[PDB]
Amino acid sequence: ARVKRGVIARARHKKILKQAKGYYGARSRVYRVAFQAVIKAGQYAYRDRRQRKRQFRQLWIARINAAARQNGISYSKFINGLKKASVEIDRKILADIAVFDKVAFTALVEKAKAALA
Amino acid sequence: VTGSGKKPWRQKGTGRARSGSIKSPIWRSGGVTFAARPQDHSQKVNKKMYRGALKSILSELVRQDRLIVVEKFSVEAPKTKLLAQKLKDMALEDVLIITGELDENLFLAARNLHKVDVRDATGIDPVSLIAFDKVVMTADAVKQVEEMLA
RNA sequence: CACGAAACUUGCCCCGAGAUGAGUUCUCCCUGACUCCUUGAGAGUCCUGAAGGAACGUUGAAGACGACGACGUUGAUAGGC
RNA sequence: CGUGACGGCGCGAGCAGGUGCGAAAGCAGGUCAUAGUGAUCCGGUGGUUCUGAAUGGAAGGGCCAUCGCUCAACGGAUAAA
RNA sequence: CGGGUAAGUUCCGACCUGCACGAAUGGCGUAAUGAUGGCCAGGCUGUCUCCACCCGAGACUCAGUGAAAUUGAACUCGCUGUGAAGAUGCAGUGUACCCGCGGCAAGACGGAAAGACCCCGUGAACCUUUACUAUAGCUUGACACUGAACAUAUGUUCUAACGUUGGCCCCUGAUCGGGGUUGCGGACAGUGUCUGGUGGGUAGUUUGACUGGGGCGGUCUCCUCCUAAAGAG
RNA sequence: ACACAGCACUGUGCAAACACGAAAGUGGACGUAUACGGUGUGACGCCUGCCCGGUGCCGGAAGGUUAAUUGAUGGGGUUAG
RNA sequence: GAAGCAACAAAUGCCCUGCUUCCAGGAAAAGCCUCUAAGCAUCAGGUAACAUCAAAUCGUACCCCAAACCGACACAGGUGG
RNA sequence: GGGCUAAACCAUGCACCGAAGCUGCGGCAGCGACGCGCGUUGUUGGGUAGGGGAGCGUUCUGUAAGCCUGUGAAGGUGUGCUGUGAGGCAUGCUGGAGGUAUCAGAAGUGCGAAUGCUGACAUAAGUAACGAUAAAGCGGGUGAAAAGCCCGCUCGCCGGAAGACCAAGGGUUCCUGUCCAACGUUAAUCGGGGCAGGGUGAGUCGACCCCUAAGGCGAGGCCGAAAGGCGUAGUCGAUG
RNA sequence: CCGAACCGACUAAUGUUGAAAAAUUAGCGGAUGACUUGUGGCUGGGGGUGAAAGGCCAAUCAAACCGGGAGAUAGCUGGUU
RNA sequence: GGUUAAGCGACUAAGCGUACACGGUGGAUGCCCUGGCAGUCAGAGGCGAUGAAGGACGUGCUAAUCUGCGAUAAGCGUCGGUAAGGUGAUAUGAACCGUUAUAACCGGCGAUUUCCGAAUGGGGAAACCCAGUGUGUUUCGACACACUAUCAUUAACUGAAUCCAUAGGUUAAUGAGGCGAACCGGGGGAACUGAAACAUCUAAGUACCCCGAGGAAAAGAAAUCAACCGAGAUUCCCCCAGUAGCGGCGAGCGAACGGGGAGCAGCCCAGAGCCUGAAUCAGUGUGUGUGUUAGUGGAAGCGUCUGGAAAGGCGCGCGAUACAGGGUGACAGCCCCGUACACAAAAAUGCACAUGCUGUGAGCUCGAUGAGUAGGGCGGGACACGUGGUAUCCUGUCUGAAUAUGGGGGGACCAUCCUCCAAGGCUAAAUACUCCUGACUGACCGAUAGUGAACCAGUACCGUGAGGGAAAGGCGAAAAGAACCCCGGCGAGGGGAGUGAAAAAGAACCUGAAACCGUGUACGUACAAGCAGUGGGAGCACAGCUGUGUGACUGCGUACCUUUUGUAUAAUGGGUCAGCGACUUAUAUUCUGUAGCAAGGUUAACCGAAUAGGGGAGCCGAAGGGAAACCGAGUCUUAACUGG
Ligand SMILES: [K+]
Ligand SMILES: [K+]
Ligand SMILES: [K+]
Ligand SMILES: [K+]
Ligand SMILES: [K+]
Ligand SMILES: [K+]
Ligand SMILES: [K+]
Ligand SMILES: [K+]
Ligand SMILES: [K+]
Ligand SMILES: [K+]
Ligand SMILES: [K+]
Ligand SMILES: [K+]
Ligand SMILES: [K+]
Ligand SMILES: [K+]
Ligand SMILES: [K+]
Ligand SMILES: [K+]
Ligand SMILES: [K+]
Ligand SMILES: [K+]
Ligand SMILES: [K+]
Ligand SMILES: [K+]
Ligand SMILES: [K+]
Ligand SMILES: [K+]
Ligand SMILES: [K+]
Ligand SMILES: [K+]
Ligand SMILES: [K+]
Ligand SMILES: [K+]
Ligand SMILES: [K+]
Ligand SMILES: [K+]
Ligand SMILES: [K+]
Ligand SMILES: [K+]
Ligand SMILES: [K+]
Ligand SMILES: [K+]
Ligand SMILES: [K+]
Ligand SMILES: [K+]
Ligand SMILES: [K+]
Ligand SMILES: [K+]
Ligand SMILES: [K+]
Ligand SMILES: [K+]
Ligand SMILES: [K+]
Ligand SMILES: [K+]
Ligand SMILES: [K+]
Ligand SMILES: [K+]
Ligand SMILES: [K+]
Ligand SMILES: [K+]
Ligand SMILES: [K+]
Ligand SMILES: [K+]
Ligand SMILES: [K+]
Ligand SMILES: [K+]
Ligand SMILES: [Mg+2]
Ligand SMILES: [Mg+2]
Ligand SMILES: [Mg+2]
Ligand SMILES: [Mg+2]
Ligand SMILES: [Mg+2]
Ligand SMILES: [Mg+2]
Ligand SMILES: [Mg+2]
Ligand SMILES: [Mg+2]
Ligand SMILES: [Mg+2]
Ligand SMILES: [Mg+2]
Ligand SMILES: [Mg+2]
Ligand SMILES: [Mg+2]
Ligand SMILES: [Mg+2]
Ligand SMILES: [Mg+2]
Ligand SMILES: [Mg+2]
Ligand SMILES: [Mg+2]
Ligand SMILES: [Mg+2]
Ligand SMILES: [Mg+2]
Ligand SMILES: [Mg+2]
Ligand SMILES: [Mg+2]
Ligand SMILES: [Mg+2]
Ligand SMILES: [Mg+2]
Ligand SMILES: [Mg+2]
Ligand SMILES: [Mg+2]
Ligand SMILES: [Mg+2]
Ligand SMILES: [Mg+2]
Ligand SMILES: [Mg+2]
Ligand SMILES: [Mg+2]
Ligand SMILES: [Mg+2]
Ligand SMILES: [Mg+2]
Ligand SMILES: [Mg+2]
Ligand SMILES: [Mg+2]
Ligand SMILES: [Mg+2]
Ligand SMILES: [Mg+2]
Ligand SMILES: [Mg+2]
Ligand SMILES: [Mg+2]
Ligand SMILES: [Mg+2]
Ligand SMILES: [Mg+2]
Ligand SMILES: [Mg+2]
Ligand SMILES: [Mg+2]
Ligand SMILES: [Mg+2]
Ligand SMILES: [Mg+2]
Ligand SMILES: [Mg+2]
Ligand SMILES: [Mg+2]
Ligand SMILES: [Mg+2]
Ligand SMILES: [Mg+2]
Ligand SMILES: [Mg+2]
Ligand SMILES: [Mg+2]
Ligand SMILES: [Mg+2]
Ligand SMILES: [Mg+2]
Ligand SMILES: [Mg+2]
Ligand SMILES: [Mg+2]
Ligand SMILES: [Mg+2]
Ligand SMILES: [Mg+2]
Ligand SMILES: [Mg+2]
Ligand SMILES: [Mg+2]
Ligand SMILES: [Mg+2]
Ligand SMILES: [Mg+2]
Ligand SMILES: [Mg+2]
Ligand SMILES: [Mg+2]
Ligand SMILES: [Mg+2]
Ligand SMILES: [Mg+2]
Ligand SMILES: [Mg+2]
Ligand SMILES: [Mg+2]
Ligand SMILES: [Mg+2]
Ligand SMILES: [Mg+2]
Ligand SMILES: [Mg+2]
Ligand SMILES: [Mg+2]
Ligand SMILES: [Mg+2]
Ligand SMILES: [Mg+2]
Ligand SMILES: [Mg+2]
Ligand SMILES: [Mg+2]
Ligand SMILES: [Mg+2]
Ligand SMILES: [Mg+2]
Ligand SMILES: [Mg+2]
Ligand SMILES: [Mg+2]
Ligand SMILES: [Mg+2]
Ligand SMILES: [Mg+2]
Ligand SMILES: [Mg+2]
Ligand SMILES: [Mg+2]
Ligand SMILES: [Mg+2]
Ligand SMILES: [Mg+2]
Ligand SMILES: [Mg+2]
Ligand SMILES: [Mg+2]
Ligand SMILES: [Mg+2]
Ligand SMILES: [Mg+2]
Ligand SMILES: [Mg+2]
Ligand SMILES: [Mg+2]
Ligand SMILES: [Mg+2]
Ligand SMILES: [Mg+2]
Ligand SMILES: [Mg+2]
Ligand SMILES: [Mg+2]
Ligand SMILES: [Mg+2]
Ligand SMILES: [Mg+2]
Ligand SMILES: [Mg+2]
Ligand SMILES: [Mg+2]
Ligand SMILES: [Mg+2]
Ligand SMILES: [Mg+2]
Ligand SMILES: [Mg+2]
Ligand SMILES: [Mg+2]
Ligand SMILES: [Mg+2]
Ligand SMILES: [Mg+2]
Ligand SMILES: [Mg+2]
Is the keyword Transcription regulation in the record (chain B)? Predict the structure, then answer.
């Protein structure tokens, strides 16, 4: 029972090279190099599903800060004021409102200022 | 492998991986690392397990209605056409026929029918009893099998 | 508030606007027609072809090659004489 | 019961037999205690209700007591570097 | 110390305090000789001060042909730091438009060869010897081939075993061989088996470990104290 | 450095010592001590001192010790009695 | 199809396998010449002249200090007369 | 790092940022309870050496004289869907005759490394080099094409050789015609290249032959476990 | 003795993926001798041969090459889908 | 409106990247088998002086090579078979042969059979050189044929020293030699290695060298075992048993007795008499059977659909003692060749009978009963057994009995008893092997695999030589292998045309992967610093807000393997791709899972036609303790246990 490896080996190598499309040079052409590149891309993607949640919150906070200071209050006092007023809107939504509904955001700032006073 | 025992090149200095034999299984045309030898693949079956399996198989043939018992089964002449007609009358196609004594005319008439086999009771085997659609036994063969399996 | 050295910043010589922060000044040149489209710093055809450049040639106290300089009959660029 | 991976090594009341000292209760299985040591193999000597290659014996073997290594590189590769 | 030089760790001549000369593993001299070692001088010069120019063959350009070592992948800068402890690739920062061609070798711990030094392996080989164990050879005796007398194991004589790489004869056209004969040796010699000695001539091997690298030195088992952190270790 | 002519020691009486060779043989040599082998020294000149305890070689052979061989004597096993 | 001679110089080639001289003292066998033995005897055989026949077979091109041989090469090398 | 006289340090306080920690929402698995494989519940799930558990796929045997397939098999190449993964399924194009469910059975059963082995193809790079610095110039010819071939004139180089001729060694390289793929370090009409035909004439040259050297073999022989060793008579052996 | 052929190999430069796995160029030593060379022969691997360097014995030498014991062994390094 | 100013700003691509499309290169993959690999059942177990194996050179209508053959040269004669076609392959052509039986083809028996090679007339650098003698023949030049080696044995003749003799010499007859894969008997005989070093020991009487034989060899008819009962030559298999023992008592080595099987067979000389030619083998003839070497007959299918082609689909039939297998334009019981079955031999030959002929001796009686031997001393070797307390066997050396009223053995030795008869020999079967021939088979390979070799391979090539040693398979069903035209050098190469189902099947030919190299298009890219991705993300292009391609700008981010305390490491390994490349196999043993049976379980060899059935020889378990005798649910210890 001799087993030739060609058909199965070709499928495995092709599966990796398909995942390497778009990479530069040997990284999209040469199995040895493409395999390492596909593994590293997987490691980065695992890491960056966690990083993505950090980077977006960081972006929302920066935009809330700018919109709050346009209305005369810092980010840190604004958040504390909302919490004292029992408002549970999260930063993703606060940043959305800060860009698309400046009148509603001003109303939220006034609510935060009243709870702080 | 046919070839000489000469070291292909010296141990050190050439810049090649070290070689010792042209017959290394690493090399094209080299030996097979664990080359096969002729083998005996037969297994031991305990006597009582062989007989136990036969009794299990025959009992299942009865429950599945694949065992047909007849008083006699024979043909007048060693003619394939006669046995084909006889089997067509009894609505049989793929059948093992177990007789008490091997009728010479019956054995010859069945040779060229590829779905049909004819044995004496002493020559039954477990795979044949499972492999055929139906099993026809003469009353005489039934007794012989009973006595054989106690 | 004032003096104070071959060190520092200048003064002297050379490079230098790819200084993408791409600078300034002087001078020269080009002043047609039409069609299509998804309609815009859009595409195409016809007519036009400037100032200037390059190429080629004869060449150089310029030169590895490129580059740089001189000259091309309205001419001394090279050889000859 | 202690102490060791193990091979081992250590402490031990009490029981049987026989003994010394003491009037007796008692004490005595070496020495105030902790170093003073060498596995196995191979053989030596004495003992022995064991074994004894046809049988009776015997040889040889076993068992009990004991002897031979600065195998000191001291868990000791060889009789011999 | 003297000589030579402006200046001489070399050279030449001396001294004797010869670490550690010395008489055939020769001592001290020695004409001639040496692609032999050291030192000095004349001549000579691009050896040099200190390089310049020139003539040729490459290098450079064009046409034709057309290699090589190397190579994980590259979008392949400097600095200071960091860090498997000497960074193009990390951190911070500076600088930097894209791409050739001729040159130069400071770095890519550049290429080349599984470091030859050092250590390790209960690795190897060959060499040495008063390492161990053997052994060819050499040497000793006993018995065998191997006998006869006489005298006192020894000695003398004898011939018939045995030796003859003395003469002669034959096979025979033959400096081999064999046979015959004669002389000389002669129970000796030589050979077999056994045996003591000798035996680097030859062979197989051994020649420990710990260790602030290895060697050298010290150590290697047992007892007591301390280190030992108030149970043991 | 090796060789070298020269020098010395030493072995060798011829079937030479010595060497190749299980052996037969062959070289040494169709030579014969003015010859042949081994060893050291290294033209030539002037020379070459003392030590024989160690290791080797040579000679000695009275004694001590000692091999194979020989098998006195003693002891044991067996058992006719 | 003319002339097609002389003189002089001259080998490392020839005379010369000589001659002279020296010590290190310089193959073999046949062809060839000669002598006889056994033998043969006006035979054979020998010598000379003449005639006649035979002399087979294989090699023979080409390179040979080289591009053809030895160096893997149309290779700066090597190759006796 | 920029910069900072606080954006430094001390003290007190309240905010906020901040992790794959905790919480929220959805999903999977291990272990244990509790009930009837299911439910419920609690809890756990970073891992090298290594132990344990459960699987994917490949070739081959049976099931299989079955099933799929020229109305298009295997293989190749795309696309879509699908599972926690190894993977699976469908289908366009290519291909043009094989393939094989299920449940079992057996293994030459899975590759990126071993300075691994074989083949193919890169890089450096159109880079180094084109093999003695004796040297070329021109006219004519032939030709698709001429620096290199042929003819001519000139120039230069060797001439105790770079000339002539043998032995050895090689073996057709010799001559003529024809061809230019490959070979020739370029081109080639030329060649020691391809193809075809031709060419080597002996009594006297050489070999063979007669004769021997060193040496070899060697009837008998002598010697040796065997194989063999030595050698006599002889017989070979040129470099004579 | 001086110096070509011939036999060597002291110095320097070049070359070092060479023209060459030891050469080329300019110089250098011997050059009637212990000289050099052609052809053939003989000595064989613990063996040969060696004016001696462990030199040489077919580009191989402190034990040649080829085949075999043979998949020696590898407490080491690498690799292991 | 224009001018000026300030600010912002697309369109560039020398080249490069990613994606896609289409190609080139290359030869993976799949599919394929006139080649291998392993066996089973049979056959044959040799060939050679009557010249082998293996070669050289020849041989055709032939230039070469292969195959065949040998100057009678791809062949000649004859007897048989068979026949409508044929003159082997490359390989067409030419000239021919044949069709009812001398074409060809197949088989038996013959003929021919150069040269080298044991090589044999001498020599020799294999395939060449040179002879002697005798018969003939001759045209006087010469030609043909046959003999001529060595050694052994035998015989004849001859014949030394030397008188007889012997040695020696000549001749004749008969035999031998050389080659071949394994198996077999004998003469010699390693080391690596293991012992964690190494010397005893091991490896191992292995490898290797040598001599000799046969189809088998060897061994073999008790001076054997046993144990007081008995067995009854040798050989082979399964047990006994990894036991008893051996052993630097280390590493290791390792029986026998006894039991189950295969197979079975006994005889002769050492000597006379009687009786005789009687058994028995060998040879040679002849018969009868039975094989072997050529051969003969051998059943049964059409229509229609798809298609280049049908054997496939669908429909309806038929044969089968034949549905083994192969082929045919895709998959055929019925197209072809076969297959089952039934038949066949002029000639040669194997076997088993029969019957001749030849040799051989059968039986009875009475005798005889293997001496430098057994044994011993010394040195070695062999026995599982290493000198040990060491029996037994062999013998290099030195010795040395009794001989049937005797002798050998029973594991030191003695006694007793038992058993056997050495020093002479022959002998089938069961056993070992396969260069070679035929048939069949495979959970064996399928072109880097399987033989080194699927192919003109032990070749090319390498080496002085011994020796080493490749790569290289596939057009199509059929060559129908591309007439003719065009560019080109009367090229190479290509474009058309034509063939074909297909020509990206066109001979550099099935499929045609990857690395690698191009052309085209979309997007990006010339102020920009690093493992080249990942998270975010504008713009553009494309297809239907989404899907696809691209990716300005931006957060984070130093490859993989190995080895390490620890590697971005400037430590190791890899230029890339494709293919191959490493925990296996056998036996023993223990544990787990699972299945059967259960105080039992199970057979081995072997028998059997048997995957059945037989076979229980054995092995494990149901009892232990003790060194052992022994005792036994106990036993050992000790005088004995409160005990342990
Ligand atoms: K391979
Ligand atoms: K049937
Ligand atoms: K500017
Ligand atoms: K002028
Ligand atoms: K016994
Ligand atoms: K120790
Ligand atoms: K001396
Ligand atoms: K000198
Ligand atoms: K940085
Ligand atoms: K550099
Ligand atoms: K050691
Ligand atoms: K060595
Ligand atoms: K004597
Ligand atoms: K010695
Ligand atoms: K330390
Ligand atoms: K240190
Ligand atoms: K303490
Ligand atoms: K020397
Ligand atoms: K003098
Ligand atoms: K003198
Ligand atoms: K002395
Ligand atoms: K002395
Ligand atoms: K000629
Ligand atoms: K497909
Ligand atoms: K690799
Ligand atoms: K290139
Ligand atoms: K060339
Ligand atoms: K050219
Ligand atoms: K030597
Ligand atoms: K060689
Ligand atoms: K050797
Ligand atoms: K572009
Ligand atoms: K490709
Ligand atoms: K012959
Ligand atoms: K050994
Ligand atoms: K070891
Ligand atoms: K060792
Ligand atoms: K068929
Ligand atoms: K013994
Ligand atoms: K091979
Ligand atoms: K092969
Ligand atoms: K095709
Ligand atoms: K292709
Ligand atoms: K990024
Ligand atoms: K690695
Ligand atoms: K390491
Ligand atoms: K390390
Ligand atoms: K390194
Ligand atoms: Mg297969
Ligand atoms: Mg893979
Ligand atoms: Mg690619
Ligand atoms: Mg790609
Ligand atoms: Mg070897
Ligand atoms: Mg193979
Ligand atoms: Mg059974
Ligand atoms: Mg000044
Ligand atoms: Mg310039
Ligand atoms: Mg006291
Ligand atoms: Mg005390
Ligand atoms: Mg002992
Ligand atoms: Mg007894
Ligand atoms: Mg110790
Ligand atoms: Mg001075
Ligand atoms: Mg002085
Ligand atoms: Mg001295
Ligand atoms: Mg002296
Ligand atoms: Mg002295
Ligand atoms: Mg002295
Ligand atoms: Mg001296
Ligand atoms: Mg000299
Ligand atoms: Mg640094
Ligand atoms: Mg440089
Ligand atoms: Mg380096
Ligand atoms: Mg190393
Ligand atoms: Mg030694
Ligand atoms: Mg140490
Ligand atoms: Mg010390
Ligand atoms: Mg303590
Ligand atoms: Mg404590
Ligand atoms: Mg002599
Ligand atoms: Mg000296
Ligand atoms: Mg002269
Ligand atoms: Mg000629
Ligand atoms: Mg040339
Ligand atoms: Mg040349
Ligand atoms: Mg978080
Ligand atoms: Mg969490
Ligand atoms: Mg966790
Ligand atoms: Mg985990
Ligand atoms: Mg299948
Ligand atoms: Mg398949
Ligand atoms: Mg299946
Ligand atoms: Mg595999
Ligand atoms: Mg791969
Ligand atoms: Mg790996
Ligand atoms: Mg490499
Ligand atoms: Mg070019
Ligand atoms: Mg370059
Ligand atoms: Mg250049
Ligand atoms: Mg150049
Ligand atoms: Mg040239
Ligand atoms: Mg020229
Ligand atoms: Mg030719
Ligand atoms: Mg020519
Ligand atoms: Mg020609
Ligand atoms: Mg060319
Ligand atoms: Mg030619
Ligand atoms: Mg001889
Ligand atoms: Mg002889
Ligand atoms: Mg002669
Ligand atoms: Mg001659
Ligand atoms: Mg020399
Ligand atoms: Mg001179
Ligand atoms: Mg040898
Ligand atoms: Mg030395
Ligand atoms: Mg050499
Ligand atoms: Mg050696
Ligand atoms: Mg071995
Ligand atoms: Mg190995
Ligand atoms: Mg001969
Ligand atoms: Mg002859
Ligand atoms: Mg002759
Ligand atoms: Mg060992
Ligand atoms: Mg026999
Ligand atoms: Mg038929
Ligand atoms: Mg049909
Ligand atoms: Mg087809
Ligand atoms: Mg007898
Ligand atoms: Mg005896
Ligand atoms: Mg004896
Ligand atoms: Mg006895
Ligand atoms: Mg006994
Ligand atoms: Mg192959
Ligand atoms: Mg293939
Ligand atoms: Mg050759
Ligand atoms: Mg096909
Ligand atoms: Mg194709
Ligand atoms: Mg800038
Ligand atoms: Mg830009
Ligand atoms: Mg960059
Ligand atoms: Mg970053
Ligand atoms: Mg480290
Ligand atoms: Mg790190
Ligand atoms: Mg580092
Ligand atoms: Mg780096
Ligand atoms: Mg690295
Ligand atoms: Mg590594
Ligand atoms: Mg390493
Ligand atoms: Mg390392
Ligand atoms: Mg590397
Ligand atoms: Mg018991």
Answer: yes
CA distance B143 to B150: 10
Nucleic strand J near CB of residue B17 (< 7 Å): no
Nucleic strand H contacts from chain B, 60-99, CB < 7 Å: none
Q: Say if CB B133 and CB B66 are below 8 A apart.
A: yes
Resolution of the experimental structure, in angstroms: 1.5
List, as ranges, residues with CB under 5 A of the ion ligand 51. A 29
> How far is Cα B49 from Cα B57, in angstroms, rounded to an integer?
12
This structure was determined by cryo-EM
Domain annotation for chain B: domains and CATH numbers: 1-149 (3.40.1370.10)
Q: Residue B96 pairs with which residues in a beta bridge?
A: B117, B135
For residue A113, say whether its CB is under 7 Å from any atom of strand H.
Answer: no
Burial class (CB in 10 A: 0-12, 13-18, 19+), A64: buried
